[PDB]
Amino acid sequence: VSATLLIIDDDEVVRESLAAYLEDSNFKVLQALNGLQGLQIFESEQPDLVICDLRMPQIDGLELIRRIRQTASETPIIVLSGAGVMSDAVEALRLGAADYLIKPLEDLAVLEHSVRRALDRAYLRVENQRYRDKLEAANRELQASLNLLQEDQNAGRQVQMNMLPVTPWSIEGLEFSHRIIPSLYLSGDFVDYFRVDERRVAFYLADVSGHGASSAFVTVLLKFMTTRLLYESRRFKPSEVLAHINRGLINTKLGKHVTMLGGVIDLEKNSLTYSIGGHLPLPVLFVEGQAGYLEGRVGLFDDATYDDRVMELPPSFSLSLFSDGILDVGATLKEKEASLPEQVAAAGGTLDGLRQVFGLANLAEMPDDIALLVLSRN
Amino acid sequence: VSATLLIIDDDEVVRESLAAYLEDSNFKVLQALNGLQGLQIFESEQPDLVICDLRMPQIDGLELIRRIRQTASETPIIVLSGAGVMSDAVEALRLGAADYLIKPLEDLAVLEHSVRRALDRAYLRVENQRYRDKLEAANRELQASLNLLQEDQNAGRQVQMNMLPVTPWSIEEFSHRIIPSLYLSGDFVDYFRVDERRVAFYLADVSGHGASSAFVTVLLKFMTTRLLYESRRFKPSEVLAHINRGLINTKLGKHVTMLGGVIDLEKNSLTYSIGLPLPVLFVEGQAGYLEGRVGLFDDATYDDRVMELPPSFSLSLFSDGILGATLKEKEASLPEQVAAAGGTLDGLRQVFGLANLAEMPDDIALLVLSRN
Numbered sequence: 001v002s003a004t005l006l007i008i009d010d011d012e013v014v015r016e017s018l019a020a021y022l023e024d025s026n027f028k029v030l031q032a033l034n035g036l037q038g039l040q041i042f043e044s045e046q047p048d049l050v051i052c053d054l055r056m057p058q059i060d061g062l063e064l065i066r067r068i069r070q071t072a073s074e075t076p077i078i079v080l081s082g083a084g085v086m087s088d089a090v091e092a093l094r095l096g097a098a099d100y101l102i103k104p105l106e107d108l109a110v111l112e113h114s115v116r117r118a119l120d121r122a123y124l125r126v127e128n129q130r131y132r133d134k135l136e137a138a139n140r141e142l143q144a145s146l147n148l149l150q151e152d153q154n155a156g157r158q159v160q161m162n163m164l165p166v167t168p169w170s171i172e173g174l175e176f177s178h179r180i181i182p183s184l185y186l187s188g189d190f191v192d193y194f195r196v197d198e199r200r201v202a203f204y205l206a207d208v209s210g211h212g213a214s215s216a217f218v219t220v221l222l223k224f225m226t227t228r229l230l231y232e233s234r235r236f237k238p239s240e241v242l243a244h245i246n247r248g249l250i251n252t253k254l255g256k257h258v259t260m261l262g263g264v265i266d267l268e269k270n271s272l273t274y275s276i277g278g279h280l281p282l283p284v285l286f287v288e289g290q291a292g293y294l295e296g297r298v299g300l301f302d303d304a305t306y307d308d309r310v311m312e313l314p315p316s317f318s319l320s321l322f323s324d325g326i327l328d329v330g331a332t333l334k335e336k337e338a339s340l341p342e343q344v345a346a347a348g349g350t351l352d353g354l355r356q357v358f359g360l361a362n363l364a365e366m367p368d369d370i371a372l373l374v375l376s377r378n
Numbered sequence: 379v380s381a382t383l384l385i386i387d388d389d390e391v392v393r394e395s396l397a398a399y400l401e402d403s404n405f406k407v408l409q410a411l412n413g414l415q416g417l418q419i420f421e422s423e424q425p426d427l428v429i430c431d432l433r434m435p436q437i438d439g440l441e442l443i444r445r446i447r448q449t450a451s452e453t454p455i456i457v458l459s460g461a462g463v464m465s466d467a468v469e470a471l472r473l474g475a476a477d478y479l480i481k482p483l484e485d486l487a488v489l490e491h492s493v494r495r496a497l498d499r500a501y502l503r504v505e506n507q508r509y510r511d512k513l514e515a516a517n518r519e520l521q522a523s524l525n526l527l528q529e530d531q532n533a534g535r536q537v538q539m540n541m542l543p544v545t546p547w548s549i550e551e552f553s554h555r556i557i558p559s560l561y562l563s564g565d566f567v568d569y570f571r572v573d574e575r576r577v578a579f580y581l582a583d584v585s586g587h588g589a590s591s592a593f594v595t596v597l598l599k600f601m602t603t604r605l606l607y608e609s610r611r612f613k614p615s616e617v618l619a620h621i622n623r624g625l626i627n628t629k630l631g632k633h634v635t636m637l638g639g640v641i642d643l644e645k646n647s648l649t650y651s652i653g654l655p656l657p658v659l660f661v662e663g664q665a666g667y668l669e670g671r672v673g674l675f676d677d678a679t680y681d682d683r684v685m686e687l688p689p690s691f692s693l694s695l696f697s698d699g700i701l702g703a704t705l706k707e708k709e710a711s712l713p714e715q716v717a718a719a720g721g722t723l724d725g726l727r728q729v730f731g732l733a734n735l736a737e738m739p740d741d742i743a744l745l746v747l748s749r750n
Binding site: 084085086089090093094097099100102114128131132135136138139142143146148149150152153155156159184186210212213214215216217220221224225228231247248251252253254255256 | 462463464467468471472475477478506509510513514517520521524527528530531533534536537538540541560561562588589590592593596597599600603604606607624627629630
């Protein structure tokens with residue numbers, strides 16, 4: 001069991017000894033009495049190495065190769081030549097030959113050296129083309145199992161696109177604009193705002209614990225219950241809504257929490273009633289080039305414990321909500337970044353202008369998901 | 379604007395013409411008056427093809443090559459000479475030269491070809507070395523974006539495992555086992571108790587598998603439980619009409635083939651109400667389906683047939699996970715003949731689940747009861 005050769009020497013005496021030696025070292029020796037049949041033995045089962053003479057009956061040495069190199073079978077060709085001709089040796093290595101030798105050679109080992117020589121500089125090429133093949137192939141059958149997921153993601157992304165309301169939906173003067181930029185297809189962030197028989201308006205912005213597929217499962221339960229309540233109710237506290245999501249996400253519902261910022265604004269008295277349950281960057285209001293958060297303080301705790309703070313609204317108004325999207329362009333400091341957004345948003349063009357500069361500049365996927373729901377009135 | 383050569387011939391008269399011609403075909407011809415400096419030219423920058431003689435001051439032709447090879451810089455090496463000794467060329471072609479030419483050749487064209495015979499058979503040697511590099515680098519570079527999206531699915535996986543009940547939850551045994559096709563599944567199974575006097579259960583195969591089929595399985599576990607946190611307590615099918623008005627109200631436009639039904643633990647009765655493969659019950663080595671026949675029709679149209687329960691019992695609801703086969707009708711009356719042959723639930727389930735872990739079209743899920 002070893003690399004197989006193919007000694008094609010006319011001399012039945014010389015080829016007799018050379019065979020017993022190579023074959024003794026585990027090499028597979030294939031003899032050939034005529035320079036012809038040797039070329040037929042090759043074409044049948046491509047040998048690994050072909051050692052031959054040149055002055056032979058029928059086909060000669062110089063030709064025996066000329067075909068072996070045209071059959072697209074670039075296999076190592078050693079020449080244990082027994083002729084002292086110079087022109088027969090130059091042209092043997094013009095066509096590409098491993099190691100030309102001379103005869104009679106006394107050391108039956110000198111060949112071994114040049115034999116395993118060519119076999120090496122060859123064997124590399126082999127597994128080289130085999131790696132190239134088994135690399136490009138191990139990849140095409142890989143991506144074919146990946147575009148299965150790459151297309152399954154887009155089937156869960158567009159399903160959310162038609163879930164959030166359209167922008168900029170303006171009613172009675174209020175421009176409920178928004179702009180979400182998920183990191184991986186569907187985001188754990190969700191924004192929705194619907195009217196209630198015209199007399200009352202509601203809205204919110206949520207951020208599911210982290211991002212990804214698991215975080216998406218919760219973005220749906222939120223859009224389903226908040227709307228389903230409409231058909232159920234024949235109509236109180238914005239906090240009572242949170243208490244509903246609560247028991248829900250608390251009733252063996254995956255076990256994922258979400259940070260919210262709900263509220264219900266009345267269009268007849270210009271009053272806002274917001275109830276908060278997450279420590280996320282509070283709702284910044286923009287009134288006359290100014291900025292400032294609000295005083296207020298999940299659904300994972302079996303205790304509602306949610307509160308709301310009634311507040312009035314000036315003629316000029318621009319409430320801005322934000323998710324766990326920080327430093328998406330200062331940074332490296334909590335308190336400094338817990339009062340930077342208000343100064344950045346106040347300096348920006350209320351909403352779009354500034355937010356647009358951040359969006360196109362760094363489309364890079366900020367860990368977690370970055371979402372924003374900006375209202376306007378002026 | 380082509381390849382760059384490196385001629386190294388003694389004769390200044392011979393090297394001059396050879397250069398003015400090679401440099402006339404867009405080739406940078408680097409000359410070297412002595413065989414030594416050439417060896418130095420090849421080290422500073424790497425020329426493409428080196429054409430030299432042999433008899434030269436300092437380092438002759440023979441040695442010159444012997445080193446260029448030792449530096450592992452396997453490049454084209456042509457050897458046109460005036461030394462007809464065979465023991466000269468023999469060695470020059472053990473060291474891996476390209477094409478041995480002879481002097482004083484009169485046609486400067488024979489060289490052109492012998493040159494592009496090496497360059498071309500080398501430009502391909504460098505392309506499949508950059509290809510092997512690009513193929514490899516890009517391969518793994520992709521793998522990094524593959525083993526990253528996969529973890530996202532897992533999140534959606536370990537988030538549902540915490541949704542379905544626990545097995546084999548034995549009360550007064552509601553076993554189960556959902557084997558999703560890939561990551562998230564459109565298959566769901568749940569069975570929650572009710573004030574100890576009455577126990578519920580159900581199974582549901584959502585329209586297809588994957589992402590858009592999973593979102594719905596979550597809207598099922600909410601409306602079946604929200605009924606508990608609302609009801610201060612009739613018909614089991616009613617719950618099916620409940621899932622209806624929800625998934626019929628702009629809910630992804632998907633549907634589900636349910637199999638609900640309440641079971642009282644005090645009167646030994648079961649009131650199912652199908653809305654997919656019927657319930658196969660195994661009692662005393664036999665089988666038999668139940669009479670019955672969604673959430674896409676604005677009309678309710680659900681029935682529920684009351685039934686008494688024997689001392690022994692083992693219902694078995696299966697989702698769209700089929701395969702005998704080769705004939706719908708045959709494979710519709712085979713699951714009962716495979717159920718009876720099976721060990722009721724752990725017999726042919728644990729024997730043909732580890733056999734083919736391969737993903738099956740649509741999600742496949744089951745929910746097997748037991749009492750004996």
